[PDB]
Every structure is written in C-alpha cells, then in structure tokens.
Amino acid sequence: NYQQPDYSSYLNNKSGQGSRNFTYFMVGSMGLLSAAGAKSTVEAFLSSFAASADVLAMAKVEVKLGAIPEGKNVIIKWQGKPVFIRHRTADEIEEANQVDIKTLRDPQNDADRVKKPEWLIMLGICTHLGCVPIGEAGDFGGWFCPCHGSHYDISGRIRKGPAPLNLEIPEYDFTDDETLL
Amino acid sequence: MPTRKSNTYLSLVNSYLIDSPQPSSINYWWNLGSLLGLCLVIQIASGVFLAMHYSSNIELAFDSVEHIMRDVNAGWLIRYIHANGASFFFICMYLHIGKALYYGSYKQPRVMLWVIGVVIFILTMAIAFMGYCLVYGQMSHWGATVITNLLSAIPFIGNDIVPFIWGGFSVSNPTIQRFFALHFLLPFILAALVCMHLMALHVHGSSNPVGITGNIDRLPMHPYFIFKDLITVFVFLLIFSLFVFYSPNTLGHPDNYIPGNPMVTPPSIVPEWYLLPFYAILRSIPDKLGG
Amino acid sequence: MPTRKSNTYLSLVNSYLIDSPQPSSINYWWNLGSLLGLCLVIQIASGVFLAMHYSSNIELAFDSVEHIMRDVNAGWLIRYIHANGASFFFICMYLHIGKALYYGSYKQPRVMLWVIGVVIFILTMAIAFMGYCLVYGQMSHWGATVITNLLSAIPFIGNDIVPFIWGGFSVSNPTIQRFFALHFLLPFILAALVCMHLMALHVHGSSNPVGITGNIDRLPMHPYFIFKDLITVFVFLLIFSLFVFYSPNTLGHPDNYIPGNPMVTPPSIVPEWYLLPFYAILRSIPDKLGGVIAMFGAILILLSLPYTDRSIIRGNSFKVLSKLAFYLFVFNFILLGNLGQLHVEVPYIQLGQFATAYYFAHYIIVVPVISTLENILYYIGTQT
Amino acid sequence: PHTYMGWWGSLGSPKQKYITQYTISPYAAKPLKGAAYNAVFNTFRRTKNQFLYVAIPFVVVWSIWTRARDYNEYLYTKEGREELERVN
Amino acid sequence: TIFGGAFAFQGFFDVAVNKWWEEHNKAKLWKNVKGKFL
Amino acid sequence: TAAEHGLHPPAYNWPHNGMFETFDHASIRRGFQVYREVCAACHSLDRIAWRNLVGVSHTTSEAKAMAEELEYDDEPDDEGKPRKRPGKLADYIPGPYENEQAARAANQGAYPPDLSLIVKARHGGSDYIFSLLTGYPDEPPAGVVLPEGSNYNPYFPGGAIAMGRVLFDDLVEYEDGTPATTSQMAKDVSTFLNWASEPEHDDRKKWGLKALVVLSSLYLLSIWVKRFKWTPIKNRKFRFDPP
Amino acid sequence: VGVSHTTSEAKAMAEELEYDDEPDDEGKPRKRPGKLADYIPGPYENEQ
Amino acid sequence: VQSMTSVVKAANFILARPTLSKIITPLAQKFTAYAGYREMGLKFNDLLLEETPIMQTAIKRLPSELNYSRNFRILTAHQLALSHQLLPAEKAVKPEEDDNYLIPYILEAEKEAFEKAELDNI
Amino acid sequence: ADPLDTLREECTKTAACKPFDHHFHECIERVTKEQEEPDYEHKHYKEDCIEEFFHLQHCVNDCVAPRLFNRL
Ligand code: HEC
C-alpha cells in the first residue's frame, strides 16, 4: 500500500512461540501470586470467626467434685453444654451389668462409658436436636429427651426415641475428689 | 426530552416506576412485588432504629430488648414492627411465589429472574432465623443450637465447622455478636439481590394472568399500577397495624420472652410459623445430613 | 452477541469495566477512583469483621476493642486495617479531588458528577467521625462532645437538637449505640452514592489530562486500564501494609488508647490528621455558628467551583497561572491542616484566619480571575 | 441522551477518514525498549518542566510557615515571655 | 485447579520467611532464651 | 510551651526496633519480673492475663504456678457464700488496689494509670517510658517549685509528676544474672510494657514481612504486565496524508 | 407514676426501701433510700 | 463557561490600545509558548472545551480538511501524552501556525445563540 | 555505676554540650541569687532554668541515645 514505519529497533529478538510462552508464565505467576495473597488474607479474616483465645481458655475448666448423694445427678457448665455428673450407686452399675448386643443403636457398657461407678460423667445434650434431657423421665431409667420423648439408659446408651447415637461422655478425666478436663 | 428521561437517575426511575410498560391485564397479585420491597424498606428502617438501642452482648441482649420495649420512646412500636414485619415479609413472599407458580411466571423468558428470586428466598430465611437468634430467648437459643448442630452433619467439614460458626464450643456471646453483625449486613446484600431481581425482570418485563404476550396492550406503571400499588400498600399497612397494635404476639412464640439458658430445654423447640413447612421436612427425614 | 453483552449483569459489568471506552491518554491519576472503591470495600469488610466482636455499649466499647486486639485471632490485623484504611481512604479521596481540580474534571459535562462527589466527601467524613467515636477513647469522647456542642449553635433548633442526637444530656451509652448503628449504615448509603457517582460518570465518560475530547482515541477499560488499576492497587496495598504492620499508630493519636472519661480533658482535643484542615477553620472562626457554617462551606464551595471556573479550556496541564494558583492552593490546604493540630497560639491563630480567608478566596476570586485572564492571554497570544 | 460520549460504534467523534494507525503485536515487541532511558531522562524532563509551579508556591507557603513557627517558638521561650504578655 | 499453585506459593513463602525470620531473630526468641532462665 | 508538651524523649535503638526485629523476650521476662516486683505496688495490668505469658516470657508451668499463688474471686456458690479460688492461666493479673480511691489515697490523690496500654497511649512509647523512669534528676532544675508529694521529671508533661524515682540501682536480683542497673531495669520494663501494649508485635511484623514480599512480587509482575500490554499503544504511530 | 400511684406515693414506697448505693470508691459499702428510678427489689438476692 | 465572544471582545478591547498591547502581547506570546500545548502538536483551538452545544455546533460546521487536520492533531497529542514524550522544536507547532481557525465558527454560533436569546426575551 | 550515668557525665564534657552546661550553671546560680532577696517570694514572675536544662538534656540525649543500648 505504502511504506510502513520501521520497527526494527522495537522488534523482539526472541522466538515466535517463545515470547508468548514467557508471557503466559508471568501472567500465570501473577494470577497465582494473587491467589496466594487472597488465600492468606481470607484465611486470616475467617480465622477471626474461630474461637477467640478467651473462649479457648474458658473451656477445659475443672469442676468442683466431691462427695454427693449416691444416684443424685449434679449439673455443671463445662463448655456451655450441661454436664450431667451423676454418682450412680452400685444398683445402677449392676443394672448396666446386663450386656446388650442388640436392641441398642450403639451397644456399649460402663466399661467405656465411665471410669468408675462412683463418678459418672455424661453430657446432657441429646443426639437429635440437642436438648437438655430430664434426669428422671427416662423410659430406660436414665435421662429422657423431652423434645422427642427419647429415653437415655443409666449407662447413657440411647434406648428409644429419635436418638442418633448414645449419650456422649465428655473427655473429662477423674482424680482424687476432682474433675480434670 | 422530558427531564425524567434525560437525567440518568430520573431516567432509571422512569424506566422502572413511571413509564415501565406493564401489561394492562395484571391483577392485584402483581402488586405483591412492590409490597415486598416496602416490607424490606420498613424492616431495614425498624432494624436500624433497633440497632441504636440493641446490645449484641449475650448477657445484655434480652435485657436491651426489654429496655427498648419499656424505656425507649416508641421502642415497643419499632420492636413489634420489626418482629411482625418479618412474618408479613414472608407472607408477601409466599403469596409472591404462589402467584409465580400459578401464573407461570417461572417459564423460559424469566428463568433467570426465577433463580435470583429463589436465592433471595433462601437468603431471606437465613436472615430471619439469624434475627430470631438475636433476642436470645429460650426459643431463640435452642433454635440456634438445633440449626448449628444440624450443620455438623456434613462428613468432611462438619466436625469442626460448627465451632467455626459458633465462635466457641456452644452458642454464646461470640455467636450472638456474629449473628447480629451478619444479620445487620445480609439484608443489605439482599437489597442488592432485590435490585438484581428487578433488572432480571425489566429485561423481559412482567407476565400477565392470561399467560400471553403483554406487548399487544401495555400501560405505563404510573399512574395506573402505581395507584394499584398504593391500594395494596394501604391494605397491607392496615392489616400490619392490626397485628402490630392489637395482636402483636400471636404470630410470635411466648417462650421467646423467657431469658435463654442452655440448661433448660423448652417442651417444644419450634420455629416461627413461616419456617414451619421447611422444619417439618427436617423433622421427617431420619438422617441429619439427609434432613 | 457475546455472553458478556447479552446477560444483563454481565452487560453492566462489561459497560463499566470491560469495554468502557476510557481515553487513551489518562495517566495513573485516573486510577484513584477504583482505588477508592477498593478502600471502601476493604473498610466494609474490616468493619463487618469488627462488628462481629465489637460491643456498642459505652462501658464495653473500649474493652471490646482491646478484646479484638489481644484475644481475637487476627483481631489486631482487622482493627488496624480499618483504622489505617480510614486514613488511606481519605488520602485517596484527597488525591481524587486534587486530580479533579487540576485536570478540570469538574467542568460542565460532569458538573452533576462533581456534585455527587462532593456529597460523598461530606458523607465520608460524617462516617469517619462517627467511627472514631466508637472506640470511646479520650479523643473519641471529647471530639464527640466538641462536635455535638458545635451543633448547638443553630438558633431556633440548636437548644434542643443536641440532646436529640445524644440520646441524653451528654455523650453516653445511647450516643455510642446510635453512632454504632448510623456508622454501620451510612457507609452502605455511601455505597449507593458511589454507584450513583459511577453512573453520573458513565453518562459522559471520564476526562483526560489533555483536557480535550477523548472520542478521537478511546481504549477499552480492560485490559489496559484494568492492569493499571492493578498496579495502583498493589502499590496502595504495599504502602497500606507498611502502615498497618510496621507503623500502625503513627496516623492515629495515642490518647485514643486511654479509656474515655468526661471528667478529664486531654491537653489537646484534635481530630485525626485528615480532618485537620476543616477543624482548623472551625478553630479560626470566632462564632460557633459561623465556625460550623465556614467548616461546611470549605467543602460545599467545591459545588460553586464549576461555575466560578470561567476557563474555556478543560484542566490546567496547559495553563501556567492556573497551575501556579492550584499548587499554591494545595500548599495552603496543607498549611491549614497543619495548623489544625496545633494549639491556639498567636501566630497560629492569625495564620489560620488568613489561611481560611485564602482557601475560600481561591474559589471565589482566583479561579474566576485567573481563568478569564488566561483565556484573554491565549487569544491575544495566538491572535498574531 | 445527547451524551458527549457514545459507545464504540459512535463515540461522538467527528469524521476522521484520512488518519492511519499502526501497531505491532506485543507478542513481537520489546516491553523495555525505553524503560532505561525513560526512567532517567524523561522523568527528569517532566520534573524540570513542572518544577517551578510546585517550587514557587511551596517556597512561599513554607517561608510563611517557618516565620510563624519561629515566632511562636520565640514567644514561648523565656526571652519572648514579655512580648507574649504584650501581644495577648 | 488454581488453588494448587496458590497453595504451593503460600507454603513456599511461609516456610522460607519463617526460616529466615527465626534465623535472623534467633537470640531474641523465647524458644532459645528459655534455657537461660531455667 | 516546652515544659507543658514535655521534653521529647530521644529515639533509642531498641533491640525490637526496625522492620524485621522482634522483641528480645529475655528483656520481656526481665521487664515482667521488674513490674511484678516494683510496679505491681502502684500500677495494675488488668488487660494482661497469665495465658498471654505462655510462650512469650514464662513456661506454661511457671505461669500456672504464679496464677496458683494468687487468690481470685471465685463465682460464689449461688447460695451467696463468697469464696476465693487459686488462679488459673485465664485469670487477669490483679492490681494492687481494688478501685480508684484506694490507689489515690494510697498515692496522695494521684491515680497510677493502668500500664497494659501506656506504651501505645503516650508520645514516643517505649522511649518515653524509658526516659521517664530514668529522667528524674538527682536535683531538680533551679527555680522550679514542687508541690507537696510530687517529684520533678522533665519528660512528664508539666514537669511535675507524682511518682518518685523507683528504679534504683541493684534493686531486683535478675534470675538470669544480668546486672540490675537502673538503666537495664528501665529498658527491660519498657520492653515488657511495649509487649503488653503490642502483644501481636512479633506476629505483626512477621505478617508484615510476608505481605510485603507477596505484594512486592505482585507489584513488579503488574508493572511488567502493564508495560507489556501497553507496548502496542506505546509503540503506536500514525500518518496523515490528505491531498 | 400516672398508672397506679401518684408520684408522691411511689416516692414514699421507694424511700421505704434501702438500695445498694454506689459505695464511696474508697470501698466503703453503704445503702441509700430508694428513688423513683430504682427497680423494685426481689425477695432473694439470687437464684439458690 | 466564558463565552468566546466575551473573550474576543476583551482581547480587542486591549489590542485597540498600543499602550496595553505593547505590554501584554509579549507576555501573552510567552505564556502561550510556555503553556506547553504546542510541543504536543496542538493548536489553541484544539484545547477548547468541545462538550458544549455551541462548541459542538461550531465543530460540526468545520470544513473537511480542517476537521481532519484537527482530528490528527488531537490523536497525536493523545499519543504523545500516553507515551510521555514531546515533539522536538522542529516538529512542534510553530507560533505562526496557531491560526485560530475555529474562532470564526464559534463566534458565528455564539452570535446565533445570542440573537435567539435576545429575540425570545422581548 | 550504670552505663546511663557514665554516658551522660561523659557527654556533658563534649564541646557540643559544654555551652549548654555552662549556660545551665549560670542560670541556676543567677536564679539562686534572685531567690535570695526578700522580694523573691513576692515577684509575680520568678526566673526558671527549665529552658536551659531542657536544651542540655536534648543535647546529651541526642549523643547518648544511639550509644547507650550497645552497652546494655
Ligand atoms: C508508687 C507510688 C508508684 C510506683 C512504685 C510506680 N508508680 Fe508509676 N506512677 C504512680 C502514680 C500515682 C502515677 C500518676 C502520676 C500522675 O501525674 O498522674 C504514676 C505515673 C506513671 C506513669 C504515667 C506517666 C504519664 O502518664 O505521663 C507511668 C508510665 C509510670 N508511672 C510508670 C511506672 C513504672 C514503669 C513503674 C515501675 C516500677 C512504676 N510506674 C511504679 C505511682 C507509682
């Protein structure tokens, strides 16, 4: 058509498919560095949602244990959820002695559900629609879930109702007249 | 050009409210949309006038609400307006969706609109529930507990996501503060989805009862459908006044006026009326994840 | 039609960010706008993540802030991001307005835009102040007291409006709760004003340094100006990281970390740095009513700037006297801000009065006179 | 909508038939052709051209500020005390 | 798909910065100082 | 006035000053010891809990022992029987005085401010504290008048301060063998108080380093990509050939 | 006041009771006559 | 904002008197030279604010050759500002080429507008 | 002797600090003489050495601050 301006000096010295490959390299590096920075920022912000140091410190709080009437169910406030510390007498232990491999959504026994019959620890929160069970309305003799009428066994096993599992046992250890979470 | 069409903002207001070519055959069921908008507005207004007196702290939440009721001038009026306006917002939305289903407004041309609408609905419930948790009544606390526990059903992330949302090992002050913040915000994200819904509507226009093209006979939204909107708005406000003044607590649950304590479980943990249809499903399905 | 142009939402995003025809000659000063948006976004984000742990109650406010700093994971980071991002938001806004004045983006076609911008500016400070009152430090409390007392100067309604805003007979728990609610909201009303500003811009497009029609050579916003915005965003975030991590409290005032008590008055009740130029005027004018009127006029006269600018040429890049006057105005503004933080000493009070006088004289004399003289000089120069 | 800027098809620009534009695919051009020479020579040229308009107002304002600050410092020192009483 | 490279960059920069920071601040950290106060 | 504004403290080259420098946690432990031994008499540190010391200046066992030494107001048996309990890591360090007038009357009307935030709440921060603790001259400048129960310290605004010099030489026996000079104790206390006001200091600067590295990489890449994308427009030429 | 009792009557009933006054910040606890703004006391200080 | 008619009237008001012309004309020439627009390939008229109905009308009535030359000058100025480089003195717009080509059309448009306003105001 | 006292009392003898120290001594002796007279208690204004003391302290601080912490 006409004489184009001379770009000789502006032309690159590098290969036709090579320079675009290098452009891809740096554009992708920018994208992935930006992704890493965004990941760091988003993780840092969402970490604020997690339990603050205050809540972590407050949890794992020991409970003032000691002598209490046998068979009486004490109540605590470890980690918000009620803790149904019960000093079940030897009668409850004997009743739990009856093994149950069937007719129980989760076969278990006091061997694992309690360290010693004189001090039984079990979270009162139910399984389906976690609620505080009644300490004496249980159809099986233990706790009862009023929301659905579920019955909690003396060993904490779910006997009847919409219970998805058995009465969870907190991770509380025992010591000399003390509760060591 | 008339000033309502040259100026960009008046141009938009004209395109949406003045010269918007609505079908002539649309009956009163098409006025729910604007009604919902009004509801949102009023809710936000009430909400703001509650935030100036509500305290997000768990120990001060319910006491601050009672302070609004008993000590703040017109605080009872604003509190009841907000509470009953949530229920009325959901009544209008249920009638809105019912009209959409009956008159087939969900079909091809407005499928996009449909999906935004659906999102709004979900978002709205995920704003209503949160609001109900702010009062920290017995029902509020136990509903928060139940919902967060149900969230744990997810296999891979459900074990630790629940403390993440709680801010602790159970519903406590971090949870209520978090819900207050997210609940003040999510209606304002929802105000953006409402605008998106309006644009997805405006692209193809609104349907009509006959289920045929409205292009044969369109009328400007003003004055005809503006005044129809005023009729429905005054009817809505009259019924809303009935509930707010003469029977405010009928829609709510009495147990929510009991200060919440995790150690006592109410005999019946149940949502407000307009979440009942969904919660029923949650009760019916055995598996929590399935529920 | 490409999907980015058929879909309504993608159509809008395209019209604003992808094929928005920006002038090719716009330099980096035109990237501040997007920067400001980012700032707003980050502020909102930080703000939300502060609302989740902040307590509006007066007795719990400062203690809750310290809870955020000391106990909440990344709480210090979010708190400092918010605090320093307020200052950075105002730095970007001041450079924004300086660019608008220098390159004459306030002239006829975008006067509407200008007006909206002015409103935003006012709103922004009436959100910043509110936020500063939330921490309820000594400076927070006494600034709230000073401002609310100044509002009492209105004759007919000033006697009883002050309790109305307070919620009581002095700054107390109702005041802090009210400020918390209004401060969480007003930024979201400002997010709407930002959209309005963007549409007022889009109607006529953006100006250019040369001050001539950009229609001869337009380029799509993407990729060119998207990547220029990325450069300025990374520079802004790098300087923001400098301040947030390595020197966060320099922009703030130490006294704000003292729990506020009405009984003890700090030796110097002074706003943060970016309110200083306005507060200086408030200090200079004797009358309280006159003081507040002049303080708000110092902003509103920007609305009169387009009509007082009788120049037939957009911008100052080619205008010797206009550039000189604008730079002298900028340095006078900096001097006014500097005087804002100093005590009321003799030379400082007279210099503050003179600085306010010249600040207003700029708009109401210099721009008219200089613009007319420069039009005459241009024509009488090229006439030969 | 007589907006002084339109969309791409009609940006409002006048007829410009006799102008031709030329560019090389960036896939073929140097990114740093002028960077080294620009950052020094061109930046110094811009700074030198724009200097006076920044300097003269800055010199004036900073001289006034220095005078005011020095006067205030003199006032609050002992030798100025009497004049501080005289001026106030 | 992108998350892989982002996580790789995050981990790499984190480990490198942590090692350099610990080495440069060695004497001033609690871990190295506790032994003296034992 | 020079006196009212208070003498500007000099900028000491703190071991923790500088972008990449962290606190000298040995100095933090020394400062905590000095505070507990001396400043605990006057000033409280309410916003610092024993839990914060773990991994900073004291092993978990050490902080546990210190907390167990103290008696804290236990939640009384809700039958209204008040009782005390051994302290836990989560308990905040107690102050010498239950409430303000106890301090003021004990301190001739002046209230020893909480030191949990003093570094952030004073111009110059650590420099100010270090200078103030060592600022008391042996003899006050001639001509000044000190009210009863007051001491002169130029770094204090107004010159007159209620506290008399407390960091006398060889006061505390450092458990690490470092000399307990007044300057050394002042430095340790200033570092400890700076940590108290900025506990996130170490993590803050480390996160700042990470952010600067990442953002600088992004910034350089963005410069390269922008000059890249703009080469076609930067190199653009024109010709205009009318008849 | 204005609901079931004249201001004087409520004033007298409040003054009959003793309320926990803000102790002199020297830690000296004391009681004060009740004011109209004081909330009616319960029979028990606490739950147990 | 200021009407081109008003500025032309003021310029003629000055130029009619050598007492002021001999003083200002050198200053005006130096100001235009220092204005820096010539080195970008622009003439004075190119700087005028186009976004005004009078200015748009004046531009529309511009002859084809002048319009194309103006378009090229504006494009060159945009390219130079974009590339942060300036034409040398050889390629710069010499003072004598600042021909004020657009002033007559702007003045015609201003006269038409003023006549309209004056006639409809009676 | 703590490092701080050593640094202060050795910087006080530098020619940079010498004029300030001499001025401080002159001012303290002058103010003592002025306070000696009976009217010293009645004079509305009484001379103070705060300014000279501040100057000397600034001069010694600007010399010791970059030095002290190397000793500690
Ligand atoms: C006994 C009395 C002490 C002791 C042993 C300490 N402090 Fe002090 N201090 C004290 C009072 C009553 C006051 C109030 C003075 C006033 O004018 O209000 C102070 C002051 C401080 C300050 C505040 C300085 C300021 O705000 O400008 C700081 C900081 C401070 N003191 C520090 C401090 C340190 C490091 C101590 C270590 C042992 C210490 N104090 C002990 C009372 C007393």
Ligand code: HEM
């Ligand atoms: C929540 C606030 C809402 C606002 C502000 C709003 C707004 C509107 C308005 C004004 C209309 C036109 C008039 C009318 O239909 O009443 C409309 C139409 C429609 N809306 Fe909504 N609406 C809301 C809720 C919803 C929701 C949650 C859905 C979910 C499905 C929905 C589905 C629809 C449909 C399908 C149409 C089309 C109706 C037709 O074409 O006839 N609406 N919307």
Ligand code: HEM
């Ligand atoms: C779609 C929008 C919203 C819906 C549907 C909604 C719904 C609700 C509901 C159902 C309740 C329960 C009240 C009760 O049980 O009596 C509630 C309470 C509350 N909401 Fe909202 N809300 C919305 C927006 C907002 C906004 C915008 C705010 C603040 C700006 C807010 C703040 C509150 C507060 C403070 C309470 C408790 C205060 C009280 O009852 O005294 N909500 N909300």
Ligand code: HEM
């Ligand atoms: C343009 C938007 C905003 C600006 C310019 C702004 C400005 C400020 C400023 C200057 C402070 C003082 C902080 C200090 O002195 O250290 C502050 C504090 C605060 N602002 Fe914002 N703010 C904005 C939006 C928001 C939003 C959206 C929220 C909540 C969602 C919020 C909540 C807070 C809170 C809670 C504080 C005090 C919390 C703390 O410092 O620990 N602000 N704001």
Ligand code: HEM
């Ligand atoms: C506060 C948030 C703001 C946002 C999100 C925003 C957004 C924008 C953007 C993206 C632009 C185009 C690019 C640029 O100019 O940098 C612009 C232009 C402009 N802005 Fe803003 N801006 C803000 C603040 C302001 C304010 C407070 C003013 C008050 C005067 C203002 C005055 C202007 C003007 C005059 C223009 C036209 C510039 C031109 O045409 O060259 N901006 N705005």
Ligand SMILES: Cc1cccc2c(-c3cc(C(F)(F)F)ccc3F)nn(Cc3nnn(C)n3)c12
């Ligand atoms: C009190 C209560 C009990 C059981 C369930 C709920 C719910 C609820 C919430 C959601 C959603 F995930 F959307 F949050 C979904 C389904 C539900 F059943 N909410 N609530 C309190 C309430 N009910 N109605 N409101 C205005 N709040 C319950």
Ligand SMILES: Cc1cccc2c(-c3cc(C(F)(F)F)ccc3F)nn(Cc3nnn(C)n3)c12
């Ligand atoms: C601490 C303080 C003292 C004096 C004035 C102020 C202001 C202030 C507020 C307004 C506005 F009416 F807009 F509210 C206007 C002018 C002002 F001088 N504000 N503050 C606290 C502060 N300063 N900077 N921030 C982010 N908050 C003061």
Ligand code: FES
């Ligand atoms: S009570 Fe709902 S399932 Fe146990």
